Amino acid sequence: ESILEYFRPYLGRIEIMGASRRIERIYFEISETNRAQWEMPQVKESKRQFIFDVVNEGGEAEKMELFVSFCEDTIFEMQIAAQISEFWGELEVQRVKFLNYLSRNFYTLRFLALFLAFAINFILLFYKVSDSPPVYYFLEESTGYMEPALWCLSLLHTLVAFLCIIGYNCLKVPLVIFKREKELARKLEFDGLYITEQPGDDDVKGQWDRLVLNTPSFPSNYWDKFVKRKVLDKHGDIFGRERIAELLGMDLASLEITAHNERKPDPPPGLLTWLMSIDVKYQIWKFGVIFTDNSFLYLGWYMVMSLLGHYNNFFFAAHLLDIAMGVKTLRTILSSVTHNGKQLVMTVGLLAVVVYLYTVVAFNFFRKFYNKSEDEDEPDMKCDDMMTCYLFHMYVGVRAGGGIGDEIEDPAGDEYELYRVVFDITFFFFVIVILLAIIQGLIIDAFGELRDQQEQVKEDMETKCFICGIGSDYFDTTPHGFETHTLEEHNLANYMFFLMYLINKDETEHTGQESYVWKMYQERCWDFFPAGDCFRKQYEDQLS
């Protein structure tokens, strides 16, 4: 009992389809370091996001493929976390310590920047303008040195912006680079995006990815550094070995002699060697991919706003919008708002169209009543020309309730009384009421749809097994059957840890089952995952 209780956390079990059609159970070992890195909370957040996008956003057909991609990405991220955990060489090691500190404290810098922006805006609240010397914009308050305090706050804010930029560059970009290299390698190995096929003209990313085809450092940040050789051996006969070599930037004789025997080079002694070791085309492609990231562009905008705030102190008020991306519920409510942004802009365009039609008819017939001047001898009409009539309607009639007719003169006492009444009533009902009703309903329906999405994801996960797909009703025949099955038999963490265990274990040490699973991982065949069957289902007659 004591041994089992001690090795319970380390003992992990999974189920596979197996070479024979009978479902089989595999027991392996889970490392303590692996479990700790898995229980890292960022891993939990990534798992939640992956589950949400694999349930709500479809992808059931490619469920196992997405799961395997998620496992690979998480392994890469936790390797990064392990690395960044707590003369020329001296400066280099000091630099790596600084970068590691920034990587570990990246989020705290973001929160500190938000607080700094709040403080700067609070100080700017006390501004005033005058004509006499302190026009003049001055910070007026009783206690002095407040302007020096604001200067110090601004300097600290920009220094923190630098730290956030460096932390993002050193923490988040490698995952994006890894994903892009993996996608490119898969495309040019299996689908042959560039061999026996050509990217489309609309594929801007496809055209941009053509740069790293010949660069020597193409397989950087990705487990496989032999993708070029594999593609050569796969498409050499059809496309031509020389053509493949020219496309991929390889040397046949060089690779052959390295396959036979190679020597060991010397480590870079100084900085000039690193300078000459820069691959310009690969770096340009890396810049091209990194600058397309939305978060990097937002951080650059933050930094540019801080630099402009140095020029003019009021530019720091733009950083108050950072709460929208900092606080999560801000993101939720603005996701509700932006879920139908195209709907809203198209609605306001339709509003512009109908208001334009009302301007045309009012210009044609209702010109007299648009006098907006109290002096009769100096009339100021706002519908004499089409431009001013359209501007008047847009600016005044839409904003003011009751339609356009409120600003217009009294229709009574003329021959067009009924026509003007119909005009005003139609404007009020079609512009003021119906269109703003659409505006309200779009937002309300967005809230409802997002709530329904979260509820659907939660219900689906609570009802169905993720790996097998069998409903909870079959397992709940036995007490706590579903709880046992989704925690002991088929566990996402268990499959992840088995993948890591296969990666770590030597090839000659793999047992029959481990080798049988391994071959398939490499051949990208997802048949070991038990879909529609389980150990209990197979051995119900034998009582498991």
Ligand X SMILES: Nc1ncnc2c1ncn2[C@@H]1O[C@H](COP(=O)(O)OP(=O)(O)OP(=O)(O)O)[C@@H](O)[C@H]1O
Ligand Y SMILES: Cn1c(=O)c2c(ncn2C)n(C)c1=O
Task: State the residues that interact with Ca ion by CB under 5 A.
Answer: 508
364/508 with CB nearer Ca ion: 508
For 156, 164, 174, 266, 429, the CA distances from 108, given in Å and listed in that order, are: 14, 9, 20, 40, 52
- Would you count residue 429 as binding a copy of itself (CB under 8 A)? yes
Using DSSP's 3-state secondary structure scheme, residue 384 falls into coil
Joined together, the tokens standing for residue 38 give 């898995």
Q: Which residues contact 19 (CB under 8 A, 6 or more apart)?
A: 516
For 359, 401, 408, 461, the CA distances from 373, given in Å and listed in that order, are: 19, 21, 11, 67
205/372 with CB nearer a copy of itself: 372
Using DSSP's 3-state secondary structure scheme, residue 265 falls into coil
Cβ 316 vs Cβ 299: under 8 Å: no
- For tokens 């060489």, the residue is 89
Contacted entry of ligand Y, Zn ion, Ca ion, none for residue 508, CB cut-off 5 to 8 Å set by kind: Ca ion
**What residues from 489 to 518 belong to the interface with Zn ion (CB under 5 A)?**
490
CB of 49 to ligand Y, least distance (A): 19
- The site that binds a copy of itself (CB under 8 A) totals a number of residues, namely 83
Sign of CA dihedral 57, 62, 67, 69: negative
Beta bridge partners of 136: 130
Residue of minimal CB distance from Ca ion?
508
- The interaxial angle of helices 241-248 and 227-239, nearest 10 deg, is 140
Q: Which stretch binds ligand X (CB under 6 A): 60-68, 294-302, 407-415, 489-497?
A: 489-497
Of 40, 64, 66, 75, which one interacts with ligand Y (CB under 6 A)?
Answer: 75
Contacted entry of ligand X, a copy of itself, Zn ion, none for residue 445, CB cut-off 5 to 8 Å set by kind: a copy of itself
Contacted entry of a copy of itself, Zn ion, ligand Y, none for residue 294, CB cut-off 5 to 8 Å set by kind: none
Per-residue contact flags (x/-) with ligand Y for residues 221 to 250, judged by CB under 6 A: --x---------------------------
In DSSP notation, 162-225 reads HHHHHHHHHHTHHHHHHHHHHHHHHIIIII-SSSSS---TT-HHHHHGGGGGS-TTTT-SSS-S
CB of 35 to ligand X, least distance (A): 13
What is the length of the chain? 544
**11-16 vs 127-130, strand pairing mode:** unpaired
- Would you count residue 461 as binding ligand X (CB under 6 A)? yes
468/500 with CB nearer ligand Y: 500
Cβ 384 vs Cβ 367: under 8 Å: yes
Of 208, 430, 447, 466, which one interacts with ligand X (CB under 6 A)?
Answer: 466
Residue 508 counted as an annotated binding residue: yes
Breaks (C-N over 2.5 A) in the chain follow: 86, 134
Cβ 248 vs Cβ 228: under 8 Å: yes
Instruction: Return the amino acid letter for 100.
Output: N
Of 65, 449, 460, 488, which one interacts with a copy of itself (CB under 8 A)?
Answer: 449
Of 57, 233, 452, 462, which one interacts with ligand X (CB under 6 A)?
Answer: 462
Residue 466 counted as an annotated binding residue: yes
**What residues from 485 to 524 belong to the interface with ligand Y (CB under 6 A)?**
503, 521
**What residues from 462 to 481 belong to the interface with Zn ion (CB under 5 A)?**
465, 467-468
Contacted entry of ligand X, a copy of itself, Zn ion, none for residue 44, CB cut-off 5 to 8 Å set by kind: ligand X
The gap between the terminal CA atoms of the chain, to the nearest Å, is 22
3-state secondary structure 94-160: HHHHHHHHHHHCHHHHHHHHHHHHHHHHHHHCCEEEECCCCCEEEECCCCCCHHHHHHHHHHHHHHH
Contacted entry of Zn ion, ligand Y, a copy of itself, none for residue 468, CB cut-off 5 to 8 Å set by kind: Zn ion
- Would you count residue 82 as binding ligand Y (CB under 6 A)? no
- Would you count residue 491 as binding ligand X (CB under 6 A)? yes
Residue of minimal CB distance from ligand X?
486
CB of 54 to a copy of itself, least distance (A): 16
Beta bridge partners of 24: 16
CB of 469 to Zn ion, least distance (A): 8
- Would you count residue 492 as binding ligand X (CB under 6 A)? yes
Q: List residues binding ligand Y (CB under 6 A).
A: 72, 75, 223, 503, 521
Annotated binding site: 44-48, 223, 461-466, 486-492, 508
Q: Which residues are annotated as a binding site for caffeine?
A: 223
Which spans of this chain sit near Zn ion (rule: CB under 5 A)? 465, 467-468, 490
* Residues of the binding site for Ca(2+): 508
